């Protein structure tokens, strides 16, 4: 019984109209939108109850709106996307009309606003098989996944073993690193480790996959460059178990 | 109006307790909210505090409210790794809108058992010019510092639990395409344990 | 206008006894001037006053956060709001403008001797009439307390009199805004 | 012994709503819904206390919702109009060429809708006229004060004209110098 939001992430070019989607909890009477610009505090945008806005930000009516289409959905519309509007957008809902209860937040939508869509690049994904020294020394085996040369940030890395996604044995960088810190348009790199027992990696019937969900260009966006369109996509790399 | 949280960030050793504070307006108080926000996830509420001098408890998490002096304390008894989160504080006046503090980012430093610091060389398979070096199996005292060369990339330490050989391990990754680069020097700008295993 | 009207009127009451020692809170709801449901501090739960307010009392009582907000209004809301205004409300004192005057005629004829007491606060006043320093216990036609609605009161206590030259009539007003009973005179 | 009352209402299909605080029969403040702000009865109150109008606005929104729930629940039962009892009186005893205030007091009525007009020599007067909001009564009917600052003369005739749906014809309450 959670608040829903779509999409996970969204990449947009300056001056465009963006429509952020949300599904408040079914019986809930109050809906909200909050936003957090990286480094800054979580800011209130708009409150809504009984098909009417309750409270709103100083910034709200000039730059935004809210539509309640059916009796299941609620949406926030950014009129003309600004660079300052790159933030994490949360939709929230409250049960009671009295306001003394808790607010339930959705998973959020990370909106990246770009001045120019030219410097957008998907990631390159490679899997590196375990060190033989490590297996010999510990009877443990760790595969590493590198995701490099992507722009912008906020990518989703996951491991798949024999088709099922795994969280056990895994650890992924909480933040990516800049490939060229001297640049404002610096592409990013990210790593993840998956550690399994040597017995497991040594079984060649065992399949290992690492994939990265990248968010970039929409099919409607303008693309004049020669390289393939840096559209939203899943880039993957795999390795098979080695008896050695 | 304005809500302030102190400290912005905090480090605590697994097993140890910590507390942090929230400063909110002393006039026109209706409620005070405490949310836990794990990096992966969405802000999830812990407590909504309305009565001054009341104390709330959710397992190991505890909170106190002082309306008259405009402050609240959040207590984490005996930190566990799953408590690593950004703890957010919110003030509610007559409406429903929440005014937030900047948060307190809590990092629960793990209790690493049976360390075996080692720097290993993983193989390329086979579509990359990169050779990767893994600094693994070191305790929580060891700190990973940034590279001194612009063409070598080093990631910060990260803890994984195997739940197959059910232990926790720290590790960092270094990489380069460079003809030069080797695992024996990859981590030279870091304070490495004296007994770190470099195989040959 | 001829279209039918529908009115919902909530009233949140805070009754104070011995200043702030015993406070009683009532959360009352009226549909078309008929009370449907209520919460009384002294009861501790919502009770339907009518059949229309029965689902509301059941629902509001089943919501622990609604109940505990009602149950605590006596300190959170009542005692708090009492203390907010006390200075300019509970301790407001405005002095009355006492003025005696007849309704006009000749002595030895009957007349009403008015005692206009205007612009005072609070409404706690005791007005007394005197004929040559002796309290006239009867023959007084009071108007009672008139609430002006501007945080001001007014009362008119007319005396039924048969005036004779040499007689001095005196109006004595006792009120909290004054330490000494105010006195106005009219000689025949 | 005192009584503070948070007295709200919402009325349909007029779509009128009110919120006010009453201390022992007198208005501390009311919230202006058009201008979304607190209107203190006596200016001095504003200097010693504060109020956040959103609390009223949020309550009025709920009141609007509850009225609609209630009217459907009651098989669409309307209110029974209770006509008012109009009274004209002055602030102070009247004296010629000394300024005074005329008080028109509308009482014991429901619904809270009235058209009040001041008339000098049968002609309407807009200059200096002030009014209270619908004040509450213990019988759940309303009160309302209309004010008229005036200069007492022997040639003036004042009338308070009140219109209500519980009245068969507009009631005129007369005042004149003795």
């Amino acid at each position: 019984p959670e608040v829903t939001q779509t999409p996970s992430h969204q990449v947009t070019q300056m001056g465009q109209e963006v429509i952020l989607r949300c599904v408040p909890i079914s019986n809930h009477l109050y809906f909200y939108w909050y936003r957090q610009i990286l480094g800054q505090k979580v800011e209130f945008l708009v409150s809504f109850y009984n098909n009417e806005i309750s409270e709103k930000s100083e910034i709200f009516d000039d730059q935004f709106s809210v539509e309640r289409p059916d009796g299941s959905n609620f949406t926030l519309k950014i009129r003309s996307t600004k660079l300052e509007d790159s933030a994490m957008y949360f939709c929230a809902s409250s049960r009671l009309a009295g306001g003394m209860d808790e607010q339930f937040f959705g998973p959020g939508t990370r909106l990246t606003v770009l001045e120019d869509l030219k410097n957008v690049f998907p990631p390159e994904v490679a899997v590196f098989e375990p060190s033989e020294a490590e297996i010999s020394h510990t009877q443990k085996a760790t595969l590493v996944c590198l995701a490099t040369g992507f722009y912008p940030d906020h990518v989703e890395l996951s491991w798949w073993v024999n088709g099922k996604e795994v969280h056990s044995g895994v650890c992924t960088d909480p933040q990516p690193l800049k490939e060229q810190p001297a640049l404002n348009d610096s592409r990013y790199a990210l790593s993840s480790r998956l550690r399994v027992s040597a017995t497991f990696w040594q079984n060649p019937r065992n399949h290992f996959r690492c994939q990265v969900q990248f968010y970039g260009l929409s099919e409607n966006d303008e693309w004049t460059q020669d390289r393939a369109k840096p559209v939203t996509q899943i880039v993957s790399a795999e390795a098979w178990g080695r008896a050695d | 109006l304005n809500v302030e949280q102190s400290p912005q960030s905090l480090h605590v050793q697994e097993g140890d307790s910590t507390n942090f504070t929230c400063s909110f307006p002393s006039s026109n108080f209706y409620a005070l909210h405490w949310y836990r926000w794990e990096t992966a996830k969405s802000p999830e509420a812990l407590f909504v505090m309305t009565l001054n001098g009341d104390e709330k408890k959710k397992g190991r998490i505890s909170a106190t409210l002082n309306t008259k002096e405009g402050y609240s304390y959040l207590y984490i008894k005996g930190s566990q790794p799953e408590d690593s989160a950004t703890y957010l504080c919110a003030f509610k006046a007559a409406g429903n809108k929440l005014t937030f503090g900047g948060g307190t980012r809590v990092l629960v430093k793990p209790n690493i058992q049976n360390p075996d610091p080692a720097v290993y060389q993983l193989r390329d398979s086979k579509s990359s010019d990169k050779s990767v070096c893994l600094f693994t199996d070191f305790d929580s005292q060891t700190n990973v510092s940034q590279s001194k060369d612009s063409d070598v990339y080093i990631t910060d330490k990260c803890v994984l639990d195997m739940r197959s050989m059910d232990f926790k391990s720290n590790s960092a990754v270094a990489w380069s395409n460079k003809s030069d680069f080797a695992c024996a020097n990859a981590f030279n700008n870091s304070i490495i344990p004296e007994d770190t295993f470099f195989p040959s | 206008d001829t279209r039918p009207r529908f009115l919902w009127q909530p009233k949140r009451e805070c009754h104070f006894f011995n200043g702030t020692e015993r406070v009683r809170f009532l959360d009352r709801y009226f549909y078309n001037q008929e009370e449907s449901v209520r919460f009384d501090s002294d009861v501790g739960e919502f009770r339907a006053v009518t059949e229309l307010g029965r689902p509301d009392a059941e629902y509001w009582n089943s919501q622990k956060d609604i109940l505990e907000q009602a149950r605590a209004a006596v300190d959170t809301y009542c005692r708090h709001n009492y203390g907010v205004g006390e200075s300019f409300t509970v301790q407001r004192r405005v002095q009355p403008k006492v003025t005696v005057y007849p309704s006009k005629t000749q002595p030895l004829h009957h007349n009403l001797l008015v005692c206009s007491v205007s612009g005072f606060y609070p409404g706690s006043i005791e007005v007394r009439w005197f004929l040559n320093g002796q309290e006239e216990k009867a023959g007084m036609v009071s108007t009672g307390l008139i609430q002006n609605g501007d945080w001001t009161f007014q009362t008119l206590v007319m005396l039924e009199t048969v005036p004779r030259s040499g007689e001095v009539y005196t109006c004595q007003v006792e009120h909290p805004s004054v330490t000494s009973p105010l006195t106005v005179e009219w000689r025949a | 012994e005192h009584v503070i009352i948070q007295a709200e209402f919402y009325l349909n299909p007029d779509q009128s709503g009110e919120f006010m605080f009453d201390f022992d029969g007198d208005e501390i403040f009311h919230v202006d819904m058009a201008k979304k702000e607190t209107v203190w009865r006596l200016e001095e109150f504003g200097r010693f206390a504060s109020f956040e109008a959103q609390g009223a606005l949020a309550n009025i929104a709920v009141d609007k919702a509850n009225l609609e729930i209630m009217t459907k629940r009651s098989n669409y039962t309307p209110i029974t109009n209770v006509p008012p009892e109009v009274t004209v009186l002055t602030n102070s005893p009247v004296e010629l060429r000394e300024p005074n205030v005329l008080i028109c007091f509308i009482d014991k009525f429901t619904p809270p809708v009235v058209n009040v007009t001041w008339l000098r020599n049968g002609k309407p007067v807009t200059t200096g006229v002030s009014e209270t909001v619908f004040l509450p009564r213990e019988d759940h009917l309303f009160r309302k004060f209309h004010y008229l600052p005036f200069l007492p003369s022997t040639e003036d005739v004042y009338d308070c004209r009140v219109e209500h749906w519980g009245l068969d014809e507009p009631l005129l309450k007369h005042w004149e110098f003795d």
Binding site: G99 | - | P55, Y59, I66, Y77, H80, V84 | -
Partner: peptide, 13 residues
């Protein structure tokens, strides 16, 4: 100090 509103609740159901 501030005057506090006793916040209203929506009716059943």
């Amino acid at each position: 100090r501030f005057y506090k509103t006793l916040r209203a609740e929506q009716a059943s159901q």
